[PDB]
Design a binder for this molecule. Structure first.
Ligand SMILES: CNC(=O)CN1Cc2ccc(Cl)cc2[C@H](C(=O)Nc2cncc3cc(S(C)(=O)=O)ccc23)C1
Ligand SMILES: CNC(=O)CN1Cc2ccc(Cl)cc2[C@H](C(=O)Nc2cncc3cc(S(C)(=O)=O)ccc23)C1
Ligand SMILES: [Cl-]
Lengths: 297, 305
């Protein structure tokens, strides 16, 4: 029993965190094999700034050891520093681009040193509601599948509303953001409907059924209600993805949609679901299945 | 900016998780130097759980009855002893991944990270608090026994909890790393129930200071309160009594924001009376009590917005 926002064990990622200093700027880097990956803003016309730099300008520190930079190149908004030593702690890994609604763990670092780990979701507006201070740039987001780490996010900046923006590990930003000081704002955010439904199934699994009713609905009637409350449209794919949770609890996806419709139209009335007075949208159907099953790494 | 429930990086603890099997029971162990620590109920059957005589069950065991597995390697047990509700298995190999560590007993209200494991393999990490009733609201399934709670301050891991059981309400009970239970619990399957739980007042106040640091002041009022009048109101909402120690502990957060502890107590009094009226504090519609004054200082900046 119990339901917590759970992050993946961070150990395989901790062994890759390094500190990168270029001039007066100090941020975090990801050391995989003989390459250190970090935000290119550590050095705007980035090619013009980069052509003026030499290898010895980049100071890379792995714990108490100085790594020697022997090459450098840019890929989109990420800087790739060729180092003279391969990371002996390099885990099995892939660079993957996630979609809005998908969740990941973040290992927040300062000065190449990990300070904390938390779980979060890529919002529909492509920002993440993280917890970062100055020096956090270069902190990474990831998931684990058995022994393989899938790096999906590198932190670049904080927007005026306090939310965060960054790139995949190939330097491509999530969202209409640019790496520079300009008027940038997060677009209007929406609620991840498929995630809220998954969390209602998690509540039913943990013995919370007060919100269930005898009614069902069409996908078309529910999507009109979803549009009114700033909820993301629910697609047939989302319905298919919720299949296992529907079969496990005996509550059809459209049957659970009618419960969500009544929660949107009438509130919680002093009640909570899994210790929360708000409808939670940062647990995917897979997160619910994994946490209510016991999958290890 | 931002405020999340943050756990400590789990890497130093992952390198200590092992699997312990005794007969048909398999649970997790903590391998530090040449000793593996695990719940003593690993020597029990389900029948034994009603009235187990651990000393009688242990005297019938030999070293080779205990199977310890570290990854794909079998560790050899060369000794065994019991310390309170923990079994200590002497092994022939010291853990090369042993970090700098201490065993610390925490008090209710204190927070820690939990590395949840099954079969000596870590599956997830989360942050939680020792409730006033000595239980923890964790997320554990069968096979989680022996999972550990910890804090990492600097490079030293302070182990404070080892998981032993789930109570009928779904909450969790366990021991410190010396085998002493938190709460009036026994590692016996009897009528055991968690006492009535209360809200950790000093933690709720710390989280209100965290909200003020992140730029939100809508909940503040022009009133102050005495410590005794605050406790007379808060007890009515099942909040823990606030002591002079708690007031002293909130000192740095009060000085950083310029809001006296008893003025923040007056805002808390008003929040309990009025609710939130469609508003949230740090993205939450409930008053959060699982962030200590120390956690807030750690996660928040020294400059108030
Ligand atoms: C809000 N930041 C600023 O006004 C200055 N920024 C300008 C800038 C422009 C482009 C890019 Cl790609 C990066 C950046 C830098 C940036 O966003 N870094 C930060 C990232 N994450 C959390 C941060 C928390 C803070 S805080 C309030 O001190 O908690 C500050 C800075 C953070 C620096
Ligand atoms: C609720 N407990 C049981 O049905 C059986 N238990 C009785 C018992 C009595 C004393 C002691 Cl010290 C240990 C234990 C064992 C026990 O508590 N282990 C478990 C630990 N943590 C989470 C657990 C989740 C579950 S569950 C419903 O499947 O989520 C089951 C078992 C868990 C075994
Ligand atoms: Cl303590």
């Amino acid at each position: 029993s119990g339901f917590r926002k759970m992050a993946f064990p961070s150990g395989k990622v901790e062994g890759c965190m390094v500190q990168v200093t270029c001039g007066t700027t100090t941020l975090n880097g990801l050391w995989l094999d003989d390459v250190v990956y970090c935000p290119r803003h550590v050095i705007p016309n980035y090619e013009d700034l980069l052509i003026r730099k030499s290898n010895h300008n980049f100071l890379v520190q792995a714990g108490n050891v100085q790594l020697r930079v022997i090459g450098h190149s840019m890929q989109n908004c990420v800087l790739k520093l060729k180092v003279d030593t391969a990371n002996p702690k390099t885990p099995k890994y892939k660079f993957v681009r996630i979609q809005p609604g998908q969740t990941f763990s973040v290992l927040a670092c300062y000065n190449g040193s990990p300070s904390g780990v938390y779980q979060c979701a890529m919002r529909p507006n492509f920002t993440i509601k993280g917890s970062f201070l100055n020096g956090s740039c270069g902190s990474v987001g990831f998931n684990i599948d058995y022994d393989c780490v899938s790096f999906c996010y590198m932190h670049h900046m904080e927007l005026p509303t306090g939310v965060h923006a960054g790139t995949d590990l190939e330097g491509n930003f999530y969202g209409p953001f640019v790496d520079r000081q300009t008027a940038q704002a997060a677009g209007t955010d929406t609620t991840i409907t498929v995630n809220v439904l998954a969390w209602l199934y998690a509540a039913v699994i943990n013995g919370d059924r007060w919100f269930l009713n005898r009614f069902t609905t069409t996908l078309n009637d529910f999507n009109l209600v979803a549009m009114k409350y700033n909820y993301e449209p629910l697609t047939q794919d989302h319905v298919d993805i919720l299949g296992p949770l529907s079969a496990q609890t005996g509550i059809a996806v459209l049957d659970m949609c009618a419960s969500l419709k009544e929660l949107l139209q009438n509130g919680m009335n002093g009640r909570t679901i899994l210790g929360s007075a708000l409808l939670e949208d940062e647990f995917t159907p897979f997160d619910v299945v994994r946490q209510c099953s016991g999958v290890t790494f």
